[PDB]
């Protein structure tokens with residue numbers, strides 16, 4: 001088998017001329033030439049079978065991506081693994097080779113307002129499809145937004161996704177968690193398990209802010225710091241928004257803080273389009289029940305050049321509603337990947 005940086009990367013003979021391109025969660029990512037389709041592709045190596053939770057993340061993503069089909073979601077082109085469960089130690093997922101991601105881009109490139117608008121449109125167009133399937137991505141952030149050379153955008157990684165469950169979203173103070181820290185909604189730290197669609201809209205709002213200035217808007221240094229950053233910009237929550245928090249520990253924490261004023265968006269972002277900031281404000285709303293939903297966001301004036309609901313498709317087959325041991329999960333991953341065998 002071909003080796004990359006000392007490790008086995010066993011994808012041939014269809015995929016040749018390998019180059020290391022980065023690191024996944026359970027393995028490395030390489031580019032490779034696809035000798036059938038005569039294009040280069042991205043390949044992620046996954047080694048999950050020793051841990052029930054790794055198997056869970058892997059199965060979840062495979063099951064979601066094999067049902068989804070959307071221009072702004074990166075699909076699975078091929079899955080490579082051994083012919084038998086006994087011999088299967090790794091799984092390789094083959095996907096379109098993109099040019100870069102938004103994390104890398106924002107490290108050195110100023111975006112024009114036209115690029116910001118088109119990127120945000122494509123993020124929300126993909127998210128409309130995801131939420132229409134009753135699925136939550138739960139880890140939206142710049143490094144999960146891939147771009148090709150003509151700035152078409154695709155959402156990566158459904159390993160933390162879940163089926164939405166709003167009736168079972170409530171929990172205690174300081175419990176959860178959901179998402180990468182900088183992109184976590186305030187309610188995660190207060191009273192939410194991250195089981196409603198509003199969790200993803202908060203993350204998109206954080207991404208929009210970061211496109212406006214090339215810096216994360218809420219860069220908390222640790223779990224606890226994240227709420228300090230959010231409230232330092234949004235200011236103190238209103239009485240009405242506090243009353244919506246029935247958990248006493250969470251509500252009394254907020255009541256214990258000195259008053260903080262809101263920082264105006266046009267002071268934080270003085271070169272931004274005013275329609276962009278109006279949409280930013282509606283995505284970064286403290287109360288998740290008042291936060292804008294994905295279809296309202298697509299219809300916002302900032303996106304008027306692109307909005308077209310008949311060209312913003314939804315899922316045909318939403319996901320209707322599982323933790324069990326790794327041996328059954330390995331079996332389930334073997335079965336879910338069978339369609340790609342010769």
Ligand SMILES: *[C@H]1CC(=O)[C@@H](O)[C@@H](O)CCCCc2cc(O)cc(O)c2C(=O)O[C@@H](C)C1
Pocket residue numbers: 021022023024029042043044095096097098099100101143144145146156157
């Ligand atoms: C999508 C998530 C993602 O891109 C980030 O987590 C990366 O840091 C992961 C490693 C690089 C992935 C990559 C790199 C290039 O140049 C082109 C690609 O198409 C990809 C890619 O498809 O990443 C997928 C597998 C994960």
